[PDB]
Swiss-Prot record:
Its EC number is 1.18.1.2. It catalyses: 2 reduced [2Fe-2S]-[ferredoxin] + NADP(+) + H(+) = 2 oxidized [2Fe-2S]-[ferredoxin] + NADPH. It is found in: Cellular thylakoid membrane. This is Ferredoxin--NADP reductase. Keywords: Antenna complex, FAD, Flavoprotein, Membrane, NADP, Oxidoreductase, Phycobilisome, Thylakoid. It comes from Nostoc sp. (strain ATCC 29151 / PCC 7119) (Anabaena sp.). It is an enzyme of class 1 (oxidoreductase). The gene is petH. Its cofactor is FAD. The chain holds residues 146 to 440 of 440 of the full protein. NADP(+) binds at residues 72, 92, 149, 185-186, 215-216, 225-229, 254-255, 293.
């Protein structure tokens, strides 16, 4: 009942791009695109929290074909239109530095994807992944800690939980727990899906809390730029108290190295009560309540 590997690299599914919209607004840093693909004509099914592969055209520096890159699925199982025939991605263009062989380098698969046109064919493998799945328990608490494109699986949980079209589509799942997104981005215009997050938070004030950490607009108490771990420390006592509930799941997604400041904060909260966080967290992993995907 979790689909995995319905399509593999040796024989991928050829989808078509339907749309490709920018998510970063003017004044923001970088390019992050929301890309939607047509799934009709194949049998790709998937659920929230999974990833798929894209195989980009071309050869590397050695004249070897390009490998697949993985992307968290950014839509619910139904697609953004709730019709069960599309899938979406949230793709940032990776680019870096002049001291990297002289001048600025562009990522292969993410440049390809963030400049791809509607009507183009794309090779898609997957779905893969069973570590970031959402429990079918309507009464769960769900803590989400996202940075940048790590909003993507979170968007599939929240959309499942709170979009009226989704609730109409999923009678078994009517969500009534509490969920809290701490979202880290560099500027207000880099808040991916801002308008839709904030609409959810005003239809459902008792069920959803939305905390930002915006590093170029906010300072932490030491005087640094505000980072998601700064906010997690700000609330580490509340977050630890929520985690003690047998129903609470915690999801962590974003770039590598973001985990260690989340543990430092929760260790100091757990310790007040003679709990050793890293022992507690091992048991949470074992029990399926601790979900991490950084990259
Ligand atoms: C499970 C998983 C989920 C992912 N989900 C998403 C998602 O939702 N959205 C998204 O945009 N991406 C996601 N990615 C990351 C994505 O797969 C690709 O790694 C990323 O898009 C870059 O691929 P590329 O082809 O653009 O870059 P490549 O062309 O392969 O460039 C990457 C390589 O260049 C180097 N490099 C990268 N950054 C730097 C730097 N700052 N300084 C120096 N060298 C550097 C490294 O050698 C790296 O291997 C995910 C990855 C994984 C593993």
């Amino acid at each position: 009942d979790v689909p995995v590997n319905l399509y593999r690299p040796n024989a991928p599914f050829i989808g078509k791009v339907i749309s490709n919209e920018p998510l970063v607004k003017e004044g923001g840093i970088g390019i992050v695109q929301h890309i939607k693909f047509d799934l009709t004509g194949g049998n790709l099914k998937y659920i929230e929290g999974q990833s798929i592969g894209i195989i980009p055209p071309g050869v590397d520096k050695n004249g070897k074909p390009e490998k697949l890159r993985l992307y968290s699925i950014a839509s619910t199982r139904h697609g953004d239109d709730v019709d069960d025939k599309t899938i979406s991605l949230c793709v940032r263009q990776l680019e870096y530095k002049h001291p990297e062989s002289g001048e600025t380098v562009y990522g292969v698969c993410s440049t390809y994807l963030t400049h791809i046109e509607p009507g183009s064919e794309v090779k898609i493998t997957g779905p893969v992944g069973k570590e970031m799945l959402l429990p079918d328990d309507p009464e769960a608490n769900v803590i989400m800690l996202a940075g940048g494109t790590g909003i993507a699986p979170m968007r599939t949980y929240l959309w499942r939980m709170f979009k009226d079209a989704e609730r109409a589509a999923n009678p078994e799942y009517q969500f009534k727990g509490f969920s809290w997104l701490v979202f880290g981005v560099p500027t207000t215009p880099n808040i991916l899906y801002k308008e839709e997050l904030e609409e959810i938070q005003q239809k459902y004030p008792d069920n959803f809390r939305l905390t930002y950490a915006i590093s170029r607009e906010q300072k932490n108490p030491q005087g640094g730029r505000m980072y998601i771990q700064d906010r997690v420390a700000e609330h580490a006592d509340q977050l630890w108290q929520l985690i003690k509930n047998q129903k609470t799941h915690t999801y962590i997604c974003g770039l590598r190295g973001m985990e260690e400041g989340i543990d430092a904060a929760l260790s100091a909260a757990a310790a007040k009560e003679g709990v050793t966080w890293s022992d507690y967290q091992k048991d949470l992993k074992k029990a399926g309540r601790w979900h991490v995907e950084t990259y």
